[PDB]
Design a protein around this ligand. Structure first.
Ligand SMILES: Nc1ncnc2c1ncn2[C@@H]1O[C@H](COP(=O)(O)OP(=O)(O)OP(=O)(O)O)[C@@H](O)[C@H]1O
Ligand SMILES: Nc1ncnc2c1ncn2[C@@H]1O[C@H](COP(=O)(O)OP(=O)(O)OP(=O)(O)O)[C@@H](O)[C@H]1O
Lengths: 521, 517
């Protein structure tokens, strides 16, 4: 029977039907995982033959099973039962799995037991036990893969300097200037578990010391020196979980016969887990429930964040155009060009807005300008006005777009006249208690045309011969007063009750003698 | 002994309002009751006895319901995480066939115990009142409640919206009981299966769907067309439709035995496994995988959206704004040492534009923007804004430009001729335009004004008076201010024509020079 099974050749995948599509592949109607190593010298190694067959005959709860081997000359590789989640080191290091310490204790104990079985049978502890080769099952039962099959790996000094990239967990004794044995040492196992426990206890990569970080070269050489102090990454200075620190301590010292057996290791682990170490069945359920709850909370927080971006993205493109645009993009395809000539516009400036303001002191007025912007905008929400521009010389607001009515705009302009008269006595310069600046404004009705231009950041533009004429005529505005023209005067006539006075016949550049009026209230 | 003390004396004092409240355990759900007056009787005694009686694995426990003069409610266990109806409604979660199927089987078992013993009936079996548990443990709510319900008569909005679930055997009556018909339970499961079968809301086949009131009197007006919403035509679950078709049985007795229902569902069962834990573990696995997929999609969309927003924001302001967006959050205006300001507008742009038709004026403005685009790529220049005809920009860069603002006039002089030469009014092919550029060289202070919609604003007496003066200028000739003419003197390679001392408002006789090229 033994001879027959050994001759059976039950480990040959033969890499013919298997389809490739870190590099997961599909074979045996199941998810697979294949890792290979550059070697072209395999033979029918009797010892390795038994090792391969025995591995294929090894099973346990916390181990990881085998499938088949790559005997083809294209390559040679293992076939392993892929598991969904990534390497454990990634698992903890993501900072997005929101672990808990009961969770971690259970993981440590499970890995302990799996290794223990790994060490109680014909297969003995594997050489390397890096924290980055402990996979998590779909049902979340820790497994320790990539072990055994001695002659099946890239056992090589070839890389030379590059070898020092990945040996950090190597047992200190084995990591000396000597040719190592493939199998490894049980002391090596104790050290491996100690270092992995450290990494799963501090939650930062490998050898996370806050005082001084050092590349792999530095850590390797430091470990190698064998200095009097027991070099190893430090333990958080707290008494909350001293037991685990002590247990790791017993596994670190270079005393080869000091790293204990796993009998006492499991004994101390159970003594600690007596806090919550209850059952062997329900553990899976509670663990998965905790993990799922945390994942759902994380995704809820991300989804909350995503809405935050949408509102801000909206605030840039849509908001530039008048709020009629707010409909235009908000299913307002009907929000298009207009031909309404009953539009009232207020363009005003600060008497000596620039010269004195800039000359007073560098960088001593810009904040005040922002304050004026904010306050006068808040008032700008006190009336139905779609502010047009805030040009350096002046800001110009014209209304009427939000409601297609020829009576609302005139009343809005008339009201804003008195509102600006008040603003004259509003937003006094805080920095200079003895400092006052007055605003001059004017209104000029007439035909106008509004339309949306621009591709990247389209904006509304409101052009009109009346607009240009109003600018050219109001360029001579006086302080703390308002000038109205004939068109706007007629607007006021039918707009509603008001107290307008007659300034007289003002000679306007390009307009000639124009009768003008003062708005009192 | 049982008479002595209720063991259902849940006063808030024990609990905290902190609408699920907490009591010395996990979260304990509550439900207010508008009773306002009590004369508890032996009937109530047996009510409490039954309330405590059952502790089945698929019946959700209560402890004690308040009986205070002003208020009363039942303190049940707050099994969190929504409802089954919801747990399929929200499109995010994607239950697979087997998952829904097993959910149905579990409901079968829970109901099987529901009233096969002491408790007679519940009557309200709304899917929304059967929630999932912390770890995939379905239950069924409000069993018992000998009188704990809104028995008060409304015959109004309550009828409109809150009674749909009861089936016609219940509907075809004017005296609703505390506990519904056994066939009533069968019907309740029938419509619950109706809702779980497909992802629709409630009692809604495709096609014509009358609104809820129409649904109500359809419920009570049933004709020989036996109006049970028919299942999905998909033939991979047609056997389910068999049960569904039977469940809402017009003949009261034909509504099959519930145990027979369970046994048929068993034969029906997908042969996954027989373990009681295995099913739970597999379910949680599927749910977790779906949640991970949701996380992935959300993250992808968030990154894409923010990338687009950043692109737009960078487009808005000058590249110095890009740098500020990079790391710097606090920005204060720069009192630049010396800059160049170019003001551009055509002669009689206002008049000509007004002459045009506004509708075609929109295309004219599009033409203007496009034609300005070409001049928009000459050298470092940030177009401040485009208000009307005037199209102005400055060449001040975040860092020293080696007197590059001298190159601003160079760029404008180069671009003006090219733009004017072969740029035409689409709606005004017959009409042509002449472009005049006014350049000044001087310092100015510029900064970001506003935060919600911050914009670069640059103020400087040079800029202001230069814009005003260039307002009136020579024809088809780039005028430069003597101030900027000297800087042009510093930078070689070009030719300058001395226009001479022109009258500038607020400036008197001020020298100006015409661009040569
Ligand atoms: N169960 C698994 N089997 C194979 N690969 C896995 C598994 N789980 C995760 N992986 C991924 O495959 C990679 C294989 O591990 P790794 O790269 O550490 O092997 P190696 O570096 O060739 O040798 P060692 O495992 O000793 O480091 C991991 O880095 C990980 O990203
Ligand atoms: N343990 C629980 N106790 C109470 N409500 C819950 C519980 N779990 C979930 N819910 C929520 O309760 C809602 C069901 O509605 P609700 O219980 O308020 O009215 P009802 O029970 O149908 O009728 P009434 O409340 O009048 O008896 C669902 O949205 C569900 O998510």
């Amino acid at each position: 029977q033994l001879e027959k099974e050994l001759a059976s050749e039950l480990w040959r995948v033969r890499w013919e039907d298997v389809e490739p599509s870190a590099k997961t592949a599909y074979y045996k109607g199941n998810l697979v995982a294949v890792k290979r190593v550059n070697r072209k010298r395999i033979e029918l190694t009797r010892k390795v033959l038994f090792e391969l067959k025995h591995m294929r005959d090894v099973q346990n709860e916390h181990l990881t099973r085998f499938v088949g081997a790559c005997t083809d000359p294209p390559n040679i590789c293992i076939l392993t039962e892929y598991c969904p989640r990534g390497s454990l080191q990634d698992i903890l290091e993501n900072e997005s799995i929101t672990l808990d310490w009961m969770f971690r204790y259970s993981l440590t104990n499970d890995i302990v037991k799996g290794m223990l079985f790994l060490h109680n049978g014909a297969i003995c502890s594997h050489g390397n036990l890096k924290s980055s080769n402990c996979v998590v099952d779909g049902r979340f039962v820790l497994k320790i893969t990539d072990y055994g099959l001695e002659s099946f790996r890239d056992l090589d000094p070839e890389q030379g300097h590059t070898v020092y990239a990945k040996k950090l967990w190597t047992a200190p004794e084995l990591l000396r200037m000597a040719s190592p044995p493939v199998r490894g040492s049980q002391a090596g196992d104790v050290y491996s578990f100690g270092i992995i426990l450290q990494e799963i206890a501090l939650r930062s990569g490998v050898f996370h010391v806050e005082g001084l970080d050092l590349s792999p070269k530095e850590i390797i050489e430091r470990v190698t020196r064998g200095e009097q102090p027991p070099f190893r990454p430090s333990l958080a200075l707290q008494s909350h979980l001293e037991e685990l620190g002590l247990l790791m301590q017993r596994c670190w010292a270079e005393d080869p016969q000091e790293r204990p057996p796993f009998q006492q290791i499991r004994l101390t682990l159970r003594k600690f887990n007596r806090e919550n170490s209850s059952n062997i069945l329900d553990n899976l359920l509670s663990r998965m429930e905790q993990y799922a709850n945390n994942l759902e909370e994380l995704v809820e927080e991300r989804t909350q964040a995503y809405l935050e971006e949408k509102r801000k993205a909206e605030a840039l493109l849509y908001q530039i155009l008048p709020h009629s645009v707010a409909e235009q993009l908000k299913r307002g395809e009907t929000v298009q060009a207009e031909a309404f000539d009953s539009v009232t516009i207020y363009f005003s400036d600060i008497v000596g807005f620039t010269a004195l303001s800039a000359e007073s002191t560098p960088m001593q007025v810009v904040t005040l300008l922002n304050d004026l912007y904010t306050c006068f905008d808040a008032v700008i929400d006190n009336f139905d006005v779609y502010k047009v521009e805030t040009i350096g010389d002046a800001y110009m607001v014209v209304s009427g777009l939000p409601v297609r009515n020829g009576r609302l705009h005139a009343c809005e302009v008339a009201r804003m006249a008195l509102a600006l008269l008040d603003a004259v006595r509003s937003f006094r310069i805080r920095h200079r208690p003895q400092e006052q600046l007055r605003l001059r404004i004017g209104i000029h009705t007439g035909p106008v045309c509004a339309g949306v231009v621009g591709l990247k950041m389209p904006r509304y533009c409101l052009f009109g011969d009346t607009v240009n004429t109003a600018s050219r005529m109001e360029s001579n505005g006086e302080a703390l007063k308002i000038h109205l023209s004939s068109e706007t005067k007629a607007v006021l006539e039918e707009f509603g009750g008001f107290e307008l006075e007659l300034r007289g016949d003002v000679e306007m550049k390009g307009k000639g003698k124009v009768r003008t009026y003062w708005l009192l209230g």
